[PDB]
Design a protein around this ligand. Structure first.
Ligand SMILES: *[C@@H]1O[C@H](CO)[C@@H](O[C@@H]2O[C@H](CO)[C@@H](O[C@@H]3O[C@H](CO[C@H]4O[C@H](CO)[C@@H](O)[C@H](O)[C@@H]4O)[C@@H](O)[C@H](O[C@H]4O[C@H](CO)[C@@H](O)[C@H](O)[C@@H]4O)[C@@H]3O)[C@H](O)[C@H]2NC(C)=O)[C@H](O)[C@H]1NC(C)=O
Ligand SMILES: *[C@@H]1O[C@H](CO)[C@@H](O[C@@H]2O[C@H](CO)[C@@H](O[C@@H]3O[C@H](CO[C@H]4O[C@H](CO)[C@@H](O)[C@H](O)[C@@H]4O)[C@@H](O)[C@H](O)[C@@H]3O)[C@H](O)[C@H]2NC(C)=O)[C@H](O)[C@H]1NC(C)=O
Ligand SMILES: *[C@@H]1O[C@H](CO)[C@@H](O[C@@H]2O[C@H](CO)[C@@H](O[C@@H]3O[C@H](CO)[C@@H](O)[C@H](O)[C@@H]3O)[C@H](O)[C@H]2NC(C)=O)[C@H](O)[C@H]1NC(C)=O
Ligand SMILES: *[C@@H]1O[C@H](CO)[C@@H](O[C@@H]2O[C@H](CO)[C@@H](O)[C@H](O)[C@H]2NC(C)=O)[C@H](O)[C@H]1NC(C)=O
Ligand SMILES: *[C@@H]1O[C@H](CO)[C@@H](O[C@@H]2O[C@H](CO)[C@@H](O)[C@H](O)[C@H]2NC(C)=O)[C@H](O)[C@H]1NC(C)=O
Ligand SMILES: *[C@@H]1O[C@H](CO)[C@@H](O[C@@H]2O[C@H](CO)[C@@H](O)[C@H](O)[C@H]2NC(C)=O)[C@H](O)[C@H]1NC(C)=O
Ligand SMILES: *[C@@H]1O[C@H](CO)[C@@H](O[C@@H]2O[C@H](CO)[C@@H](O)[C@H](O)[C@H]2NC(C)=O)[C@H](O)[C@H]1NC(C)=O
Ligand SMILES: *[C@@H]1O[C@H](CO)[C@@H](O[C@@H]2O[C@H](CO)[C@@H](O)[C@H](O)[C@H]2NC(C)=O)[C@H](O)[C@H]1NC(C)=O
Ligand SMILES: *[C@@H]1O[C@H](CO)[C@@H](O[C@@H]2O[C@H](CO)[C@@H](O)[C@H](O)[C@H]2NC(C)=O)[C@H](O)[C@H]1NC(C)=O
Ligand SMILES: *[C@@H]1O[C@H](CO)[C@@H](O)[C@H](O)[C@H]1NC(C)=O
Ligand SMILES: *[C@@H]1O[C@H](CO)[C@@H](O)[C@H](O)[C@H]1NC(C)=O
Ligand SMILES: *[C@@H]1O[C@H](CO)[C@@H](O)[C@H](O)[C@H]1NC(C)=O
Ligand SMILES: *[C@@H]1O[C@H](CO)[C@@H](O)[C@H](O)[C@H]1NC(C)=O
Ligand SMILES: *[C@@H]1O[C@H](CO)[C@@H](O)[C@H](O)[C@H]1NC(C)=O
Ligand SMILES: *[C@@H]1O[C@H](CO)[C@@H](O)[C@H](O)[C@H]1NC(C)=O
Ligand SMILES: *[C@@H]1O[C@H](CO)[C@@H](O)[C@H](O)[C@H]1NC(C)=O
Lengths: 171, 317, 318, 171, 318, 172
């Protein structure tokens, strides 16, 4: 993808993360855990539902048209009827092929983008208390029990509380 | 002394292959089909008014072939013509058959009003054993076969004004005998003529005497013509032989009606989109069931499948 | 002992809603309309040459219905036919009227050249009270109603070569009397015929006899036909009755000319794009005014508005 | 948007930034101030004007065509003329709808991208003298008067001049 | 004491200009052309079966104009008509010529099967010095010009059933004499008639006497008509004069055949796509050579060039 | 481009990089050098070949169609034949114009992205041992000989080996 997170610096997906599209796994002295990130999950889902609803909106309604199958050979007028329909079908077929190609490229990029945005947001919370290990993980340089982890996941982590401990450990 | 916190995304063991700008096949966690490719095989009778022609074409119902008179005054959103249909009256053809079928189909009705045409000096209501109605000889219900009375067939000259506020469709014909004995025996004149006109249009047809192939015992034919009379205009019919006269007019409507050739059964169920293969759902934007459709239908495309990704790239390893 | 430096972007109290791939409505700071949905209601008389047909259809100006005589030799880029137009000459029809109207409209001129046809043994210039020119009887200016002279109408058999370097359009017709008495009284033969040909083409018409509804006093009709003769080809006309003869040819051109039905008034102003509703600007790529257009026009679409974002997402509040 | 800046880590736009599209606000020892960034603003404007000029370039010119309204019922030929026109209009209407959707998605992403580029460029100038506070602001760990702020805004800031002071304050 | 590690990308001294959403021209390192704009100027004779009409149109080959009889029973994927083609037989017209030409071109064969029609009481095999076959007078090979025998021309009334499982195409005609003397010398009756029908179709043509332009000595004409007869149907031909009879039928086929007008020479080479200008390669998705094509062809577009970027932005200098 | 690397923080391309699309130049105690990065180069090439092959795939095959040139004026039916073709050509010409505009915008952005992804990946390997100089170059704060540079280029660099040395140089 354009952002290089999914199928990129994140080595692979998690089949065990069932209640969200994106999320956090941790290991600390209390064990390991996992939780979905609701906001990123919902941002991707909303964009994809938005896209989907634009596409499957309102088929056209047509009534009397032209004939499209013929039981007798007739020449010029039938040649034109068949050519008009064949032309129409080829143009719509092209439209359908192009539409899904563009949409799908964009769905893969926007989902990659949401992974990357969650990664960036987490890093910004952690300030000088953690380092990016390069694989979508942060090494956190202070004791970080379950409540502390949850404070990162819920956006209330106060980096200043831990900064002295963390800097001593990093440097 | 510390902890690790990893960011990640979900995956599934087996995702779905889709196409992009750069890849003919790439796996995502989920996708949805945009091409409708199946039908139940049955045409739903709601919400459109469907009229099953059964053994009858629309033109045979129009003319009033006796086995099709069940359809007199009927209406439809969609007239469905079956492959088993057959004609069972006087052998005929219709120059520009396709146009007459189309304009009646689009009008969406066979509503017919009889008018009091006076035919002085001729015998009315001719019939044939090629067109039985009950046990006896008969003829199209909507046409009036005129022949001689006594030893003459005078010049017919009749008019019918349109004093209504809608357009009238008149269906009429010309008889082509197979022999001179037949021509003179029916119409006295050795050669006939039929002229039907309005203030703005005219048609004169000269009958042609000769053998066509035997159909229902007959080498003779009728040719069918039509004339539209607008409000305030007038119909005049002038003939010294071979006229197959109208008995009145069909009321012409405009709206959403059409016609379709199909052998699919009609079922009681609901579907906006009709194809000859049956009704199809219209939740998807495209369909590959049939280029022929009626109603609110997905657009026909050549592809039998097109998958829209609805999830991220699937990377279970 | 430090500073803060924040990055940001502008916003406005209320922007404009636009559509994207993912959103049916999302607010951006600014947008521009891509559908032209309005017209002044008037057709501008420049830069295209507009010819107002007034009370005349193009076919009646072609044939030379007397009240359309003012259109003789006219030219146009766009001929405008009005709903008030009416015919006031011999009652007629044109099999494939739409095709004759189209090819004349596309040629863009009624330039007519009279030719010295000789019609030996018939009376020329027949007229009718259905087609008055002043208080007296008349006929289409470009057509010549031939009838018997003395007690006979001989077979007419004439040719007119095209030795010019452009195509000639010939308009001619066939008279359909209402009775046999009329037929014989005018043409002597009990049934006429008209055959008009070039080297590789022919049309043969047999008149139709019978009563039809009165139009300006008449139960009779004329049917109009047309024949194009290319350079080096020739015209031959052969008839033993009922010929409505040509008087000459219309010069055919190719170019940008056309015809439109409209009741919009013509105004002194300039616009490349014309619709029946009036002229419209063509700065936008699309328009929803009318699927019928002439000139450099935006493409007709069903949407009445389509907004192209020309600024960022408008986010005045969190 | 794809880059996560506009309507993202930058919480909202500034109605008070009336002379530019993107820019800087600061607080230092001489007070507070705001300035537009001309280059980022002009890059966004130039791309938008470029795409607009492509879209509004050159209407086709057509002259004699087909008839599109009819006063009498005719059947087959008229059915065909009407079908041809209806088919054409539906295809152009689709092209128009898709064109503005793709264009508009791209305008939102390219404007988000310009905001993010300006942010990254600023961070890169500051080197080890500042930290990303996570809301589009940088905390600068040294005295940075008005001339110093302007040196950042104009791309001439010399991080080395302040590094000793900054590192002492951060760590 | 350290090191520096710089990341970068390549560039070239001059790349190629392409178009994007936001730029009419921007330089990338490489691009590829998507519009085929050239042809060799020759039509390749493989893989499609090409039949060069040389001096003949498809209709003249169909009817059997003697100088076109080389084409008897020929087949083609693509029939190529040349501007130098000429007719050299009885002068004729075909109402709806374009449709007969189209349906024969599409059928892709002139396979003809003679049938044993019986024409009782008329003289067969009429010919003309307008249509020489070798040194003597002759006629179209597929048609049979019937005239009186002794002093009479009876009512012809013949039938030919289709008991095959393919459709039969019958080509037939009607003679229009230039004078009444010719009409009666040939056909006895003063006015003829031809009626040809199947179980659900019929066509009656009344000849029209009179002069057309002199062509190869003749001011008379033949008009050509056609009738298709399906399996289980039957043909009836009924005439009391002026019938130009069929000798049998053309076998109809369905498939990929067509026809094209071109003066391009035909070379020994291989190309799936044929235009009147010559064959063109079909590796690109679009082409601007000709809107007329046959085979697996790029789509015709107006642009003469469209470049697809195949490299990054070329930024050799700041 | 959207990512701001090519024609952005990378000030220009290298005409002297003639064996790859993306790569590295270094200076250390053993001199200077250049090396193509094969993975980034191939990722861009593979995406571009992917989109090219989608675009040049499968022309349509058509046989008998309608006539498109005419030697005689005929009016209504010819008007319609010519309009149907003109309409078709204008629609395909529009599809062709739009297709190359969209593809080309995207090719520029995907190549910019691949540059940016390589830069970010390199940064991530270096951890606290280097700083981004802001022009696509990293200042590495330890002795880093040819084998060390190659360990970065091949993705096996061990930041812990050098961390003490680098931090001493960066911060003290
Ligand atoms: C109804 O009206 C039409 C139109 O007027 C008449 O048609 C004309 O008929 C005449 C007589 O048949 C035709 O005359 C013939 O022209 C041929 C073509 O001439 C061209 O080539 C020659 C030689 O190269 C040139 O000299 C000439 O200028 C032309 O370029 C000639 O080849 C014929 O000549 C041969 O036959 C004639 C007559 O038998 C002899 O005089 C000659 O010596 C020679 O043997 C011949 O002259 C003329 O072409 C017709 N015109 C058109 C437009 O069709 C009908 O005849 C008339 N019908 C009736 C029943 O009256
Ligand atoms: C002009 O020529 C025409 C063709 O030869 C003549 O038409 C023929 O006329 C005869 C006499 O009426 C018809 O004969 C009748 O045929 C029917 C139908 O026969 C078919 O079906 C039956 C039953 O299934 C079957 O038994 C036969 O084998 C046929 O398959 C018979 O039922 C009658 O008894 C009667 O014999 C011909 O059908 C008809 N042929 C065609 C092709 O139309 C016509 O008579 C001639 N006209 C003149 C003036 O002489
Ligand atoms: C065949 O029937 C038609 C229609 O019935 C007859 O047409 C009619 O002919 C009469 C007698 O000329 C016309 O009368 C005229 O009416 C006008 C009023 O508009 C009046 O001003 C005149 O003084 C005259 O009386 C009548 O309009 C006309 N009707 C129609 C519908 O055309 C025709 O006469 C018949 N033909 C024959 C040969 O009998
Ligand atoms: C964010 O996470 C923290 C850590 O779990 C939450 O604060 C704790 O809440 C638990 C359970 O309610 C209490 O036992 C602790 O006393 C809280 N600790 C602190 C540091 O306050 C906090 O409620 C969460 N905030 C939000 C917005 O959900
Ligand atoms: C894969 O994506 C599709 C489309 O978003 C999902 O189908 C929708 O699911 C909801 C909830 O069941 C339905 O109410 C909608 O009607 C569905 N929409 C369509 C277009 O079918 C589907 O659930 C997703 N599959 C998985 C495994 O998540
Ligand atoms: C066939 O339908 C027609 C058209 O609706 C019927 O004509 C109408 O009949 C009703 C009831 O008698 C009248 O109120 C209308 O005024 C009639 N319309 C016209 C224009 O005359 C006709 O009665 C129907 N025929 C039958 C046998 O039901
Ligand atoms: C819908 O009906 C159409 C028309 O009968 C079917 O298309 C035909 O399918 C058969 C078998 O594949 C082919 O031999 C014909 O050539 C097809 N005709 C055309 C015009 O395509 C079609 O398969 C049906 N589809 C469904 C879903 O029932
Ligand atoms: C341009 O003129 C057209 C044709 O009259 C107008 O379209 C008609 O508008 C009326 C009233 O809205 C409708 O009832 C008709 O159905 C329309 N006819 C057609 C053919 O669409 C149109 O509104 C005019 N446009 C403007 C902007 O003046
Ligand atoms: C292929 O042949 C076509 C048709 O002859 C050429 O198109 C003509 O080109 C000339 C000169 O440019 C124009 O004046 C005509 O108007 C064109 N005719 C039509 C019908 O478009 C075309 O140039 C040829 N293309 C190539 C590559 O040889
Ligand atoms: C909105 O966008 C258009 C197109 O660029 C521009 O002409 C107009 O002046 C803009 N208005 C503002 C407020 O910038
Ligand atoms: C029409 O133009 C022609 C050719 O220029 C000319 O001979 C003729 O006299 C003109 N007619 C009128 C009414 O001016
Ligand atoms: C950048 O900023 C400083 C003021 O802090 C000023 O002295 C210098 O001239 C500026 N350079 C430019 C290019 O404006
Ligand atoms: C390459 O050539 C063109 C002229 O054909 C020139 O305008 C363009 O700037 C050149 N590109 C570079 C990178 O110098
Ligand atoms: C330019 O791109 C095309 C298409 O992939 C390729 O065939 C050609 O060799 C390329 N040229 C260069 C300079 O790489
Ligand atoms: C012409 O083709 C037909 C149909 O294949 C064949 O049966 C017939 O014998 C052929 N005639 C000749 C002379 O080869
Ligand atoms: C990476 O480079 C180092 C240093 O030269 C070398 O020891 C090792 O073999 C390389 N590893 C790979 C995977 O090529």
């Amino acid at each position: 993808g354009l952002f290089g997170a999914i199928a990129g610096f994140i080595e692979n997906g998690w089949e065990g993360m069932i209640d969200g599209w994106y999320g956090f796994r941790h290991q600390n002295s209390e064990g390991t855990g996992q939780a979905a990130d609701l906001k990123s999950t919902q941002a991707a889902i909303d964009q994809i539902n938005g896209k989907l609803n634009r596409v499957i909106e309102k088929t056209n309604e047509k009534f009397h048209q032209i004939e499209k199958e013929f039981s007798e050979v007739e020449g010029r007028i039938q040649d034109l009827e068949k050519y008009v329909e064949d032309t129409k079908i080829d143009l719509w077929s092209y439209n359908a092929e192009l539409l899904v190609a563009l949409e799908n490229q964009h769905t893969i990029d926007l989902t990659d983008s949401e992974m990357n945005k969650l990664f960036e947001k987490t890093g910004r919370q952690l300030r000088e208390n953690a380092e990016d290990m390069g694989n979508g993980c942060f090494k956190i340089y202070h004791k970080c029990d379950n409540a502390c982890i949850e404070s990162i996941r819920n956006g209330t982590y106060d980096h200043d509380v831990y900064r002295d401990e963390a800097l001593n450990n990093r440097f | 002394p510390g902890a690790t916190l990893c960011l990640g995304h979900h995956a599934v063991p087996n995702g779905t292959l889709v196409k992009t700008i750069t890849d003919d096949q790439i796996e995502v966690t989920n996708a949805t089909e945009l091409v409708q490719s199946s039908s139940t095989g049955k045409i739903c009778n709601n919400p459109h008014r469907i009229l099953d022609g059964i053994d009858c074409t629309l033109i045979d119902a129009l003319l009033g072939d006796p086995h099709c008179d069940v359809f007199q005054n009927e209406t439809w959103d969609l007239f469905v013509e079956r492959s088993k249909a057959f004609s069972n009256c006087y052998p005929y053809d219709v120059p520009d058959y396709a146009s007459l079928r189309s304009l009646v189909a689009s009008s969406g009705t066979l509503e017919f009003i009889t008018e009091g045409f006076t035919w002085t000096g001729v015998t009315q209501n001719g019939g044939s054993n090629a067109c039985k109605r009950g046990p006896g000889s008969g003829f199209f219900s909507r046409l009036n076969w005129l022949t001689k009375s006594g030893s003459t067939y005078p010049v017919l000259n009749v008019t019918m004004p349109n004093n209504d506020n809608f357009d009238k469709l008149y269906i009429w014909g010309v008889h082509h005998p197979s022999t001179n004995q037949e021509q003179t025996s029916l119409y006295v004149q050795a050669s006939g003529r039929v002229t039907v006109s309005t203030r703005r249009s005219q048609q004169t047809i000269i009958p042609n005497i000769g053998s066509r192939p035997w159909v229902r015992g007959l080498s003779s034919r009728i040719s069918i013509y039509w004339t539209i009379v607008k409000p305030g205009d007038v119909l005049v019919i002038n003939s010294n032989g071979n006229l197959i006269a109208p008995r009145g007019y069909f009321k012409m409507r405009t709206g959403k009606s059409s016609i379709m050739r199909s052998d699919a059964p009609i079922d009681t169920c609901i579907s906006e989109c009709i194809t000859p293969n049956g009704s199809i759902p219209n939740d998807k934007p495209f369909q590959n069931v049939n280029k022929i459709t009626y109603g609110a239908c997905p657009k026909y495309v050549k592809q039998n499948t097109l998958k829209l990704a609805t999830g991220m790239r699937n990377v279970p390893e």
